[PDB]
């Protein structure tokens, strides 16, 4: 039901008693193109193990995007550490206008029309986290009405 | 490489028994042959790489059923090997996977040589599979249908979506079963003449059959009126396209004015 | 900075500095060689690079790199000089175009003929 693609594979090293030990990190996004998305980061000695662990993690850290006409309800700017993300709604027939990481995250969420921008530090991990945070902080007309009026 | 459960399904649809023998073409790594050895009795492999062969020599070391023959599948006396290796088995099947380009010629050869089999099970390609098993009045009905129903009864048992492959291919796949019949459906006075007539009939889809027969046949122009008269006596319409005709309809014409 | 400070002082604009002073805002220049010789690259690299000391129409003396497999440059050859920096050589900021005035396109090139002169070889 959930389809998977890779954000990035990296190999990190740590010193030992005369030698180097390498561990692989995977950033994985999962989705259904229906308004649900998940992100995970998996660290393991081996690449397949890293991918499995990252997917496993992503399958619980789950977010529902309030899609409407395949676009974001409203614009939002979000800061995570030294990274900044900007998302803006688009009219039907625009397309996903994003970098590798934001495009990958937004496509699986079912978003079809959006204008994005990256500011400050452009480290993939922080950009991905910022994107997820921005997605989590989205509201619709109904939600605002319910909170205000009641 | 394919998912390990699908191959089980193809083997099941081969109705393999502990008594039957199988001829497998192009094992490659050797997924299929493995999942055969188990339920089969004797496996013979025709394969020519010298590159993936060490992998193949290894993968089959467990079993004592499987044997490898380093000979061309097309440059082989199939009768000889079938009689030589299989003196003990009751029935014989053929299950294999073919490497695109040379898929039609192999099947054509195995059928024209009228080997003592029960059936052929091959993955083939979806489009080719559809073309093989078609009713007379289809859109994809053609020469290939005539060629295969002339030797066997053919039907596609299942469909293989293009998604189940790790290297994503450009085209789909199917699984087809071709049970040999105990002799051709219709008698022919000359098998060659039948073959040229079939190929000439479906040369141009859009044009009517009569035009195709008169033009395509090498000496058709020499004897035009003769063709029309023979067609008329058979109660077959010239203005009718060749697509609609069934096997027997063409067979009568093949008899015709030989 | 406060808006009042912006009003009082404003913002300084950055000026781009030309990397090719000799050409004086021209695509190419015409010069005459004076010294034809070879030099050695920096520490990572090790080769012999052909370099010509060219006097241009403008009152500048420069060093230009000679690309290709072989050349035919004397000490009086009229040459055309083009923009382009050679990293490893410390001081050359210019190139020589093949097959223009006195420099000829290097022989028997077959792949990149747009550069290095080389009229198309007619094959029977």
């Amino acid at each position: 039901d959930f389809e998977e693609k890779m954000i990035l594979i990296r190999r990190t090293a740590r010193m030992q008693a005369g030698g180097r030990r390498f561990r692989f990190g995977a950033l994985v996004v999962v989705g259904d193109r229906q308004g649900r998305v998940g992100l995970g980061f998996g660290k393991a000695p081996e690449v397949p193990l890293a991918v499995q662990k990252a997917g496993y993690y992503a399958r619980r850290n789950m977010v529902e995007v309030p899609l409407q006409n395949g676009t974001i309800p409203h614009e939002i700017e979000v800061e995570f550490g030294a990274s900044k993300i900007v998302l803006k709604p688009a009219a039907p027939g625009t397309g996903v206008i994003a970098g590798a990481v934001p495009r990958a995250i937004l496509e699986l969420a079912g978003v079809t029309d959006i204008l994005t921008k990256e500011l400050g530090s452009r480290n993939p991990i922080n950009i991905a986290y910022a994107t997820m945070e921005a997605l989590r902080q989205l509201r619709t007309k109904a939600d605002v009405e319910r909170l205000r009026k009641g | 490489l394919i998912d390990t459960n699908i191959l089980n399904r193809i083997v099941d649809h081969a109705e393999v028994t502990e008594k039957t023998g199988v001829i497998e073409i192009g094992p490659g790594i050797g997924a299929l042959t493995e999942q055969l050895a188990k339920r089969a009795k004797k496996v013979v492999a025709f394969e020519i790489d010298q590159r993936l062969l060490p992998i193949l020599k290894d993968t089959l070391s467990p079993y004592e059923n499987v044997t490898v023959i380093h000979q061309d599948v097309l440059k082989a006396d199939v009768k000889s090997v079938i009689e030589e290796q299989f003196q003990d088995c009751d029935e014989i099947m053929v299950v294999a996977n073919l490497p695109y380009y040379v898929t039609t010629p192999i099947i054509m050869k195995l059928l024209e040589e009228h080997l003592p089999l029960k059936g052929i099970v091959v993955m083939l390609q979806k489009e080719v599979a559809e073309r093989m098993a078609a009713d007379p009045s289809s859109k994809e009905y053609g020469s290939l249908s005539i060629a295969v129903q002339f030797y066997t009864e053919a039907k596609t048992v299942m469909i293989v979506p293009k998604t189940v492959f790790v290297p994503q291919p450009n085209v789909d796949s199917a699984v087809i079963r071709l049970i040999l019949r105990d002799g051709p459906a219709v008698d022919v006075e000359n098998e060659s003449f039948f073959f040229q007539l079939i190929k000439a009939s479906f040369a141009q889809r859009r044009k009517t059959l009569l035009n195709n027969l008169v033009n395509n046949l090498p000496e058709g122009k020499a004897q035009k009126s003769t063709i029309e008269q023979v067609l008329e006596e058979t109660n077959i319409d010239g203005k009718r396209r060749g697509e609609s005709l069934s096997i027997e309809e063409f067979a009568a014409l093949s008899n015709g004015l030989y | 900075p406060t808006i009042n400070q912006l009003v009082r002082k404003g913002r300084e604009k950055v000026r781009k500095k030309s990397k090719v002073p000799a050409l004086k805002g021209a695509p190419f220049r015409r010069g005459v060689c004076t010294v034809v010789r070879t030099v050695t690259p920096k520490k990572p690299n090790s080769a012999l690079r052909k370099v010509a000391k060219v006097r241009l129409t403008s009152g500048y003396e420069v060093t230009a790199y000679i690309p290709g497999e072989g050349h035919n440059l004397q000490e009086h050859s009229v040459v055309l000089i083009r923009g382009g920096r050679v990293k490893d050589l410390p001081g050359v900021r210019y190139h020589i175009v093949r097959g223009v005035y006195d420099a000829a396109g290097v022989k028997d090139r077959k792949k990149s003929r747009s550069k290095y002169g080389t009229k198309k070889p007619k094959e029977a």
Partner: protein, 208 residues
């Protein structure tokens, strides 16, 4: 100067059956029935996972080769479509269809686009009872497209349209086989065509 040379080579590179040859690509010799792998020495070799840029470029290329226009003309049409009102994808697809060569192909005067271009170029086709010899001509809703009086007796046209008898034309076109003519009713919708193309990929490709 359009692309002249091998055709079903593209069938292959693109991995999808692009009907660019006529009726040969309906026989068992489409070159996709056989050898359905990318053209070249390295055609059967494990393919590395395609980049996003590669995917977008391939989608864009697929489309362009279906209609057989240049990159320049394609870009101009895209720019024109983007500027107009409505969904960029639908408008863009509409514009490409209105090509006179496209239309005469769709009506069935030719089996291929490559020869539809030839028939339109050589003055065999007329619009509103006036000779037009330009493949790039854009037809508006309500135009009448017919065969020239002089060209009615040619065997090619007769053979082509004879095969068209007893087959439904596209819902946005009308045909009269007897009079050897046709009428442009309206701009085709997104669903009305069936081109194997995801237009969003083309839009994003040109967005960069």
């Amino acid at each position: 100067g359009r692309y002249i040379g091998p055709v079903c080579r593209l069938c292959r590179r693109e991995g999808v059956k692009l009907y660019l040859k006529g009726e040969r690509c309906y026989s068992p010799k489409c070159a996709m029935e056989r050898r359905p792998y990318p053209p070249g020495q390295h055609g059967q070799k494990r393919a590395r996972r395609p980049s996003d840029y590669a995917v977008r470029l391939r989608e864009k290329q697929k489309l362009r080769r279906i209609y057989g226009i240049s990159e320049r003309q394609f870009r101009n049409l895209f720019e024109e479509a983007s500027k107009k009102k409505g969904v960029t994808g639908s408008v863009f697809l509409g514009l490409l269809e209105s090509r006179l060569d496209n239309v005469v192909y769709r009506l069935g005067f030719a089996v291929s686009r490559r020869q539809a271009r030839q028939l339109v170029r050589h003055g065999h086709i007329t619009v509103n009872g006036r000779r037009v010899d330009l493949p790039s001509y854009r037809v508006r809703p309500g135009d009448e497209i017919a065969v020239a009086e002089k060209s009615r007796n040619l065997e090619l046209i007769r053979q082509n349209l004879e095969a068209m008898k007893g087959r439904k034309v596209g819902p946005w076109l009308s045909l009269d086989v007897e009079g050897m003519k046709g009428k442009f009713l309206r701009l085709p919708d997104r669903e009305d065509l069936a081109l194997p193309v995801n237009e969003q990929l083309v839009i994003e490709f040109y967005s960069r």
